[PDB]
Amino acid sequence: MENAHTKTVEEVLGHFGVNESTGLSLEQVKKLKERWGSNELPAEEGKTLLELVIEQFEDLLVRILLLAACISFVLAWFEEGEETITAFVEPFVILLILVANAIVGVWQERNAENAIEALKEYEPEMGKVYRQDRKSVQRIKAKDIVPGDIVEIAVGDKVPADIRLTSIKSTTLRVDQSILTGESVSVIKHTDPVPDPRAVNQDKKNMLFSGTNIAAGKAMGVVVATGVNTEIGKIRDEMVATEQERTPLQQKLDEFGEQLSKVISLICIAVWIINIGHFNDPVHGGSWIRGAIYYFKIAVALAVAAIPEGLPAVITTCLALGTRRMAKKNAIVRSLPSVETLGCTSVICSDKTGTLTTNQMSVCRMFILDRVEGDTCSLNEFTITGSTYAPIGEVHKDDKPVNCHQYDGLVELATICALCNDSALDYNEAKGVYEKVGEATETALTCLVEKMNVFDTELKGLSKIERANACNSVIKQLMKKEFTLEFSRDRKSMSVYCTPNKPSRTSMSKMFVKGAPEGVIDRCTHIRVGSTKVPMTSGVKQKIMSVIREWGSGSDTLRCLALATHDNPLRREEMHLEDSANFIKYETNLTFVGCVGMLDPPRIEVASSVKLCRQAGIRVIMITGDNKGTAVAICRRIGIFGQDEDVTSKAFTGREFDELNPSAQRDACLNARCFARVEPSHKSKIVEFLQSFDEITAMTGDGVNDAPALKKAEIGIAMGSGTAVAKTASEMVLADDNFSTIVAAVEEGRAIYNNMKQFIRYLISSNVGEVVCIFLTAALGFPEALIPVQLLWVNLVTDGLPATALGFNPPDLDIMNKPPRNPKEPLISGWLFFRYLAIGCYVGAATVGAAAWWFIAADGGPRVSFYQLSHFLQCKEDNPDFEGVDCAIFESPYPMTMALSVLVTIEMCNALNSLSENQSLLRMPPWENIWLVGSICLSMSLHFLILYVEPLPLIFQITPLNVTQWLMVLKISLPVILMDETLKFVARNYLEISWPFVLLIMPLVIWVYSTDTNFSDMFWS
Ligand code: BEF
């Protein structure tokens, strides 16, 4: 309605019916919802279809092919444009492959993006709020938040809408507003009004902006603007982006592309220089200009054929399929470079609490101090049943020594639990499980205090939703809290000074301490037994410590915390200086040193995933801020640490890690799988130490403690049910909150790299085969077997659709058993270059051999000796060598169509066996890739179309064929697959079976080779 930063707290609350510590009436909530509108920010699309198709065309390889198409169109100008069949087919053939690749890429990328947006709505935006229906804070959808409504926020939470600080419930509130303000450093905030009529966002410390994160604080505010009216919504029209897509893989592939373009240009120059020197034959070649333009067209067609023009398209489709597959498995990938480098990940750091554990925390055990007869102390050691956040589900098993809960010490413990926490429960209509608000520990204590510990009141039959609010409200109303002590890692405890509402019966002064058992057992010097207090005893404290250690002995890995009482505080806030020394000085002596036991179940799908990670060669390290013993126990349970293992030099804490010999420090950073009780700075130091060893690091976490370190790691991962600070600092978000997605991401990255390698291998082999064919034909003096339109058609049929569909390859069988690759090694090894050269040499030799076969030994063709073939140009119709053979036959379109068909079929066969690097088709039948088979069938259908209709063969300078020539084509094209299988076998064994497939291939093979009458060839020179 109006700006509120200048206005004070009183009138902004009085602007609406809103009141502090209470909520808003439902009727006025819906009235303001109807008037102002929902808190939804329009998600406009930033990538239109036109730019989406243009972004594929921008690359050196595609631009060269566009230039070649333009050159072909220019050179085609020998007759008016009305004729669009005789001379207007080669530019169309050049254009068709680019169009097909662009369509495939845009379709795949659009599918991936459409999948991603639906995933972002898997968990609707949630925000804590105060309403009049439920007395305590309740979570509601952030899409429905009216202005002027009380909204509580805590550490590690996104701000649903612009809120003015009505009150602060913590000592200091530090809020990170980097996304809006651009200030990386967190900004301290206060409730003082803004004295600037138009304050800059930097100097506005009175209000919190929507979309911002709180680094460290607890606060409650009033929403002033919602939806687009928020400071993040009005400026949302302005577009912000990084515009960075140069992944290391794409950078090295671009380097490979430019080197390959240089080599292809050199090869084309060689073609020009070697060939035109002897060209003076009178096939419209007695003039230099005509021969020059013809051989220039030949060179342009060879350059078109010999460059991989689907490379950007295949990269784009591989990334799009990876992202879409992660979208299906409920993982939001906000950074394309992440998944591919997840293939190269070598160390996975992780956050024990919240990510590896299931994050739903419940009370399980409780011991009070029974009657003590001296050094030894008898301990009650109760047990509590129920792991879900439900008061109704807890019955205390009715078997413990007390079921009426009449123990005075139990009453005191319940009061401590109720009055020493800042958490609550709420009932959501979505499920039957009551949601957790606040820290897990405090919420578990709150659901602990529900049972009739203090009073045997008959609350049966009351409101279902009132349980979570009235469970501890009775204790709260009879004893008024005064103030609290900040939780500091120096003492690892929290303290609350409370004065009972009781009319001065109990001295009106109490202190309640919630902390670690060690800290309180050291600080406590006065024990509580029954209703009385006894002097400190070494035996009692030692037995309590032994019970705590037993609770930490593999049952639930020591999640217990202690709750203690200080009966005689020195004074009511005599001094409250914000230093750790005073807080410890205020806890000199205490009482009721008994503890309570908690359970944090490790996630089921973690251990197996960990077992996968060590199979892939990826080390897993647990870096957490918890105790060393708890961390080691959780590691052993998960499987990072072997049971009964020497963990002397593999587990560390932050303090001992900091003070080490640099040689010892670097050795420990390599060989340690567990760091415990580490501050965020220490986690970042560990991550950067790991990265300094040329090692790719991936880290996961769901807390602010892990937020800085996630930035240092190469890959950052945040769980869906975690703090939004981790999400903003991470690259991949696990909405489903399932640890199995990480190994799937590593698998997809490795699969993308493998498919890229297969595409490179297939294209390089086929195209060097075509180049070797041209060189062999030129060198041996044989008639030229490839004219520009035929070369362009080969480029269209063997490079466009099958190679693009090669990007849909299913993952390899041994993909998850290989060590992670080093991103610094050369893209193509020496062995791969040899494989490409061998396959290309065979392809070229096979095509030249097919042509020479038609000229020399053919069933429906003339028989011409090899000597005559090598000297075909030397024809004067009267040569004694050339007697009885018409030398116009050397212009026959039959050898040309032989070469065309042989090249096409051999390249399809090469595409068939390019499914895997070193795996035979017997192990990997092509039926797993239906896209590749369909593409091959469609391309062969196109070949049969251009070969067996009336007009099409005329424009391609080819003729229809019969069964015998096709059989010869298949016979000369098959051995490429056998040669590739031999190379794969050699690579498998010396360098490093589907019976149905054999039963299909064998009869077809014997059918092809049933009749053989193609031997007795002449000498090769
Ligand atoms: F144990 Be982690 F730092 F939440």
Ligand SMILES: [Ca+2]
């Ligand atoms: Ca090509």
Ligand SMILES: [Ca+2]
């Ligand atoms: Ca090719």
Ligand SMILES: [Mg+2]
């Ligand atoms: Mg955590």
